[PDB]
Curated annotation (Swiss-Prot), chain A:
This is CRISPR-associated protein Csy1. Disulfide bonds: none annotated. The gene is csy1. Belongs to the CRISPR-associated Csy1 family. Coiled coil: none annotated. Disruption phenotype: Mutants lose phage DMS3 infection-dependent inhibition of biofilm formation while there is normal biofilm formation in the absence of phage infection. Decreased production of crRNA in the presence or absence of phage. Disruption of the entire Y.pestis-subtype CRISPR region disrupts crRNA production but does not alter phage resistance (possibly OLNs PA14_33350 to PA14_33310, and the flanking CRISPR loci), indicating this CRISPR is not involved in phage resistance. CRISPR (clustered regularly interspaced short palindromic repeat) is an adaptive immune system that provides protection against mobile genetic elements (viruses, transposable elements and conjugative plasmids). CRISPR clusters contain sequences complementary to antecedent mobile elements and target invading nucleic acids. CRISPR clusters are transcribed and processed into CRISPR RNA (crRNA). Cas3 and Cascade participate in CRISPR interference, the third stage of CRISPR immunity (Potential). Involved in crRNA production or stability. Interacts directly with Csy2; part of the Csy ribonucleoprotein complex with a probable stoichiometry of Csy1(1),Csy2(1),Csy3(6),Cas6/Csy4(1)-crRNA(1). A Csy3(6),Cas6/Csy4(1)-crRNA(1) subcomplex is also formed. The chain holds residues 327 to 434 of 434 of the full protein. In this bacteria, Y.pestis-subtype CRISPRs do not confer resistance to phage DMS3 or MP22, but instead are required for DMS3 infection-dependent inhibition of biofilm formation and possibly motility. It comes from the Bacteria.
Length: 108, 335, 228, 335
DNA sequence: TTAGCTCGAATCGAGCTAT
DNA sequence: ATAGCTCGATTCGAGCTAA
């Protein structure tokens, strides 16, 4: 919960940057997560990316952060074989569905 | 005391090349030297949602709203030219020999015992059954994985090369030789003798393998599929890319080698499925299961350990499987 | 002021000072023999204790890096499956019968290295006990990595007596063993003055070189070598 | 008492360059100066569970679950073109001279004694046996490490480049000259005398070595492999990285030097392995063991200490080993 | 605990011997 | 390997100072 709270805070403090930093040129700029990283691009782009962000409602960012957390957890096969990984996956699913519900209503 | 080594790396025999795809017309196979190559092409696809939902996405309003925005993708596709019904797939195969000698080992006593075991096998039962099965998988176009599943006629030609010229040529009908039975044929016997001479170290064996499959005018062929780093947008997702070397659709060499290794008809489960690729723990990706589990003591590692350390020679079929595993190579030997 | 000696280390001040802010300062540089480790500009109002406390952290991280770099290699006793570790022994050297090994079920106990490419042999509990007795590493075996091989050899024709700096690795309060010079002299059955004559600086006329038996018995009694 | 020096650094003779890999067809190798380079490219590999399991991963459910999640990764792969069967590998070799002189020496008396010892060696028998064995490893394509194991015809061309021009040309059949025996041949003798003049310091010699290997059309070639930091995603893992300098597959210069260094046939163990690289403690990476153990009193350091410090000259074979190790160079002496 | 220092006495190495 | 010697240099113990 503290990791997901800090992720939400980090997006909130990126919200104070320039509105159109996501439109800068670059080969790797994380376009999948740039919809969530810069909400303010929809103001300048009335028809380029505002409707895409409204209709798509990107919640795969939660899946990518869950994959990052899976990369950040210890690779213990004893937990994976036992139900400890089951409880860990259940609590991770609860925290990520809460986090996805947070990112769901960002268009209001 | 003869404990097994911590590193037992083996180099692969039966080295296959990348198999290139070109296309043309049937009865022009004798003049198929300058056939145009099959080129990987870009096309745009749009589809509706068809995956299973997890009982929470089954809301009709949400499903209809998802259909209002169908996914847009671009994919790589390989097709024949419209004036061409035959697929030509050509690769080369080197048969090396020296299967039982590891490329890396720790224990010299284990290496000597394993080489003695392999020499005992070769003396008692040479590379004959294995070579017959390899020649069978080479004479039926199993390396044409999805390219012969619905072909009207599949015809493969095997040539033997010494000085850049054909030393002996083989002509086969790949639909007559099925994907199931390892029968006996005089041309197949000669090809098996050549593979045996290659695997025994008697001489150099280089074979070019050209397979012709009459599929249809402008039909879709199926080359090897690569991976995508997925660093683009959601419109041009590039969800599918195909393998090519120089603007020519190709099949990965390891896929051809996997199709050539499909000789294992000795796994404990019922052989109604047919042959499977020779590999430790008999793990086929299609069914996602492992024939020759270590629990039933018929995997490669337990058989090799019993044959070399305890001198418990398995059945001739199981030692054929073990020697085929030595032929395919590997990084056998844990810490 | 004057140079501060902490075991093998030395904090010597600069001959000329400077003024940082409005206060006088000198640069104090830390050595490990001839190797300069760090320099700090310190106020002239610091005592020796504060100057030593300024470099205590660098000395501590040197000690940690020396313990991790020269740690003795570990042998592991495992079962037939080779997965469960039954006993761990740190050895000064490996058995000469170690070869590339994966445990079988032919023998119940196997002795294996902790290194990732594992070396080993089948071993009984009596043989494992004998090997652990005659190969074990003393608790301060990492200090031997900081000493040359010509002072740690048992060959008397290839042996060289340790210098004062090599003695101060193990003999002082600022050394790696932490025992005093009087305690080291008590361990050898020697007078404290005679043992101070061993660790006497170069600015001295009475200097004695330690003998083969005395040096090796000191290493035994300090827990550095030949103590299992 | 003339103890040994603490600093005994040596510089290497027989300096090779990086060996570049190009491709083409046999019987046009006389016009191979414009052959296209072999390019390192990417392909995708899909693998199953083929390594040993530690008695806890051998459960059928866990093994099948590991099958359902295969390891996807990309590998750097170098292949010949489908119309080219010959691999060309070219490097330049420079032989310096002055082997017994260290680059750094603490003791002047030990320096003088070592110089007298090496001068006594050269006066007794010069760099003739060592240069003959180096010329043998030049004549056979041992620097063509895995590209020689299955090549049908291997030919090595060695030129002497005096003023940027071929002052003397050698052409060899690298398969007639095996990897086991150091025989005598007139052209081998001439190249041996040239390398001897290089090692003695009589003149400057620069050798351009070009090797052609007839492997097959589209067959895999094996350049040197690099290190992977192992930080990216598991799907795009880059499990194998190949060495290239400018979009051209290359072999490391130290690998070429190690293959030329394989002249040591005098180690105490038997001649089953054949020659090994002249290294202190006779280390072979593939076998994971050390011939010439220090316990057996036949390593470089004990022989050098007996020869120089206390005038115990070993056998002429061990003298050849010691001088070849001085040619090899290294940071000798107590650190 | 560090860092030394005389002062006579015992020890140390490397020469020789004898049996 | 035993058994023992001489002779000059080095070590050794127990006083002492010096901090």
């Amino acid at each position: 919960a503290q990791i997901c709270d800090e992720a939400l805070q980090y997006a909130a403090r990126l919200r104070e940057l320039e509105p159109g930093w996501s439109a800068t040129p670059g080969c790797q700029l994380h376009d999948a997560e740039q919809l969530w990283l810069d909400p303010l691009r929809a103001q300048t782009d009335e028809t380029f990316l505002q409707r895409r962000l409204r209709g798509d409602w990107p919640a795969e960012v939660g899946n990518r952060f869950a994959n990052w957390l899976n990369r950040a957890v210890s690779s213990d096969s004893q937990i994976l074989g036992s139900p400890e990984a089951a409880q860990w996956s259940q609590e991770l699913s609860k925290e990520l569905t809460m986090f996805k519900e947070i990112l769901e209503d960002e268009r209001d | 005391i003869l404990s097994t080594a911590s590193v037992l790396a083996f180099e692969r025999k039966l080295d296959p090349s990348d198999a290139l795809m070109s296309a043309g017309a049937w009865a022009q196979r004798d003049a198929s030297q300058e056939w145009p190559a099959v080129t990987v092409r870009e096309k745009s696809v749009r589809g509706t949602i068809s995956n299973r939902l997890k009982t929470k996405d089954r809301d009709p309003a949400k499903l209809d709203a998802s259909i209002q925005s169908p996914n847009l993708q671009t994919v790589d596709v390989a097709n024949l030219p419209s004036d061409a019904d035959t697929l030509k797939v050509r690769f080369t195969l080197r048969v090396l020999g020296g299967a039982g000698t590891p490329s890396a080992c720790n224990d010299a006593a284990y290496r000597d015992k394993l080489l003695q075991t392999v020499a005992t096998y070769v003396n008692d039962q040479g590379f004959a059954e294995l070579a017959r099965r390899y020649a069978h998988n080479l004479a039926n176009a199993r390396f044409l994985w999805r390219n012969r599943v619905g072909a009207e006629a599949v015809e493969v030609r095997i040539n033997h090369i010494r000085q850049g010229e054909v030393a002996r040529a083989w002509r086969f009908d790949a639909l007559a030789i099925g994907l199931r039975d390892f029968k006996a044929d005089a041309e197949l016997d000669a090809l098996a003798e050549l593979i045996a001479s290659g695997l025994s170290g008697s001489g150099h064996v280089l074979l070019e393998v050209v397979a012709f499959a009459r599929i249809g005018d402008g039909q879709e062929v199926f080359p090897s599929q690569e991976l995508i780093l997925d660093k683009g947008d959601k419109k041009g997702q590039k969800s599918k890319t195909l393998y090519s070397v120089r603007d020519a659709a190709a099949i990965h060499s390891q896929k051809i080698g996997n199709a050539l290794r499909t000789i294992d008809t000795w796994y404990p489960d019922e052989d109604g499925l047919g042959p499977i690729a020779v590999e430790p723990y008999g793990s086929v990706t299609s069914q996602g299961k492992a024939y020759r589990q270590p629990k039933q003591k018929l995997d490669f590692y337990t058989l090799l350990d019993n044959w070399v350390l305890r001198d418990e020679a398995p059945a001739v079929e199981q030692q054929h499987y073990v020697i085929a595993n030595l032929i395919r190579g590997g990084v056998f030997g844990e810490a | 002021m004057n140079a501060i000696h902490i075991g093998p280390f030395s904090i010597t001040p600069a001959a000329r000072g400077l003024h940082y802010g409005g206060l006088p300062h000198h640069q104090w540089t830390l050595y490990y023999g001839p190797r300069e480790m760090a320099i700090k500009t310190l106020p002239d109002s610091y005592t020796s204790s504060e100057v030593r406390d300024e470099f205590s952290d660098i000395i501590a991280e040197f000690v940690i890096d020396a313990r991790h770099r020269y740690a003795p290699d570990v042998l592991e006793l495992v079962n037939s499956d080779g997965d469960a570790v039954l006993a761990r022994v740190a050895v000064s050297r490996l058995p000469e019968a170690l070869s590339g090994c994966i445990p079988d079920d032919r023998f119940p106990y196997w002795l294996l290295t902790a290194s990732r490419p594992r070396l080993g042999l089948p071993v009984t509990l009596n043989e494992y006990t004998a090997l652990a007795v005659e190969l074990s590493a003393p608790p301060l075996a990492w200090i031997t990595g900081l000493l040359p091989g010509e002072v740690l050899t048992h060959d008397a024709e290839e042996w060289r007596p340790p210098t004062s700096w090599e003695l101060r690795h193990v003999v002082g309060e600022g050394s790696f063993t932490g025992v005093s010079g009087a305690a080291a002299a008590a361990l050898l059955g020697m007078s404290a003055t005679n043992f101070r004559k061993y660790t006497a600086g170069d600015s001295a006329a009475n200097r004695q070189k330690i003998s083969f038996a005395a040096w090796h018995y000191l290493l035994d009694r300090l827990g550095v070598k030949r103590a299992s």
